[PDB]
Design an enzyme around this catalytic site. Structure first.
Site, short mmCIF file in Angstrom:
data_model
loop_
_atom_site.label_atom_id
_atom_site.label_comp_id
_atom_site.label_asym_id
_atom_site.label_seq_id
_atom_site.Cartn_x
_atom_site.Cartn_y
_atom_site.Cartn_z
N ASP B 25 -82.27 8.89 -42.48
CA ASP B 25 -82.99 8.97 -41.23
C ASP B 25 -83.21 7.66 -40.45
O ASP B 25 -84.10 6.88 -40.78
CB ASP B 25 -84.34 9.60 -41.54
CG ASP B 25 -85.16 9.85 -40.32
OD1 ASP B 25 -84.61 9.76 -39.22
OD2 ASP B 25 -86.34 10.17 -40.47
N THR B 26 -82.43 7.46 -39.39
CA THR B 26 -82.56 6.27 -38.57
C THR B 26 -83.88 6.21 -37.81
O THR B 26 -84.28 5.12 -37.38
CB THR B 26 -81.38 6.11 -37.57
OG1 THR B 26 -81.15 7.34 -36.85
CG2 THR B 26 -80.14 5.68 -38.30
N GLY B 27 -84.56 7.35 -37.67
CA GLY B 27 -85.84 7.40 -36.98
C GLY B 27 -87.08 7.21 -37.85
O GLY B 27 -88.22 7.38 -37.37
#
Ligand SMILES: CC(C)[C@H](NC(=O)[C@H](C)NC(=O)OCc1ccccc1)C(=O)N[C@@H](Cc1ccccc1)[C@@H](O)[C@H](O)[C@H](Cc1ccccc1)NC(=O)[C@@H](NC(=O)[C@H](C)NC(=O)OCc1ccccc1)C(C)C
Ligand SMILES: CC(C)[C@H](NC(=O)[C@H](C)NC(=O)OCc1ccccc1)C(=O)N[C@@H](Cc1ccccc1)[C@@H](O)[C@H](O)[C@H](Cc1ccccc1)NC(=O)[C@@H](NC(=O)[C@H](C)NC(=O)OCc1ccccc1)C(C)C
Lengths: 99, 99
Positions: B25-27
């Site tokens: 998850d880049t967020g």
């Protein structure tokens, strides 16, 4: 562009003639933007995340320029504290994770 | 490995001798895993996402094998419905976004 992750992967987007900053988010199925006015016809919808679901408005075939790459797709609008570019649009600009 | 985004970027992780599936998850600023037992000393902490904050336990220097690449870092544990590998560990395995 190759984006490392030491900092939040925030990029410049252009939607509805407006310039905004948005998070390239591999963990979001959908694209959800902070409150803003869009092209009319929308359908109600809800999205879940950590700690609780929110209600959002779903707009179809919305044009969005992401760091210079155009994409058209579904964009949700509602009370999110950050602009989120989800996988539905990330696949359109050919974005991938690599390690 | 190059991971496209037509499907959720779920990978196999090994932590505490257990095998699990987790979302790259880049967020997510942090790494947050569903309830599980970890090595003892932890500090309270809260994390926010879409729709509401949750309370979690912060464990330091935890070993975690992500799709075969080892990394040691802070891991949070609490009521998240999915295992999340955040940027703190994504940078350790040299993960980047590309388009
Ligand atoms: C930004 C949101 C669109 C994002 N949520 C999603 O993509 C969620 C899974 N999807 C979601 O709401 O899709 C529709 C849905 C509607 C009703 C029932 C079940 C599913 C989110 O909070 N994502 C975070 C992680 C996450 C995912 C699930 C639960 C908790 C945290 C970061 O990647
Ligand atoms: C999985 C979580 C760790 C993730 N949240 C985070 O990384 C948030 C910003 N960070 C977070 O909680 O960090 C600590 C903090 C603590 C107190 C006050 C302010 C910040 C999340 O829900 N992320 C989703 C998007 C998001 C971010 C902020 C708000 C709403 C949705 C998907 O990427």
């Amino acid at each position: 562009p190759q984006i490392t992750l030491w900092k939040r992967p925030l990029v410049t987007i252009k939607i509805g003639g407006q310039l905004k900053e948005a998070l390239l988010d591999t963990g979001a199925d959908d694209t959800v933007l902070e409150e803003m006015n869009l092209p009319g016809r929308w359908k109600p919808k809800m999205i879940g995340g950590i700690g609780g679901f929110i209600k959002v408005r779903q707009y179809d075939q919305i044009l969005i320029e992401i760091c210079g790459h155009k994409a058209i797709g579904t964009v949700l609008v509602g009370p999110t504290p950050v602009n989120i570019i989800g996988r539905n649009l990330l696949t359109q600009i050919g974005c991938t994770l690599n390690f």
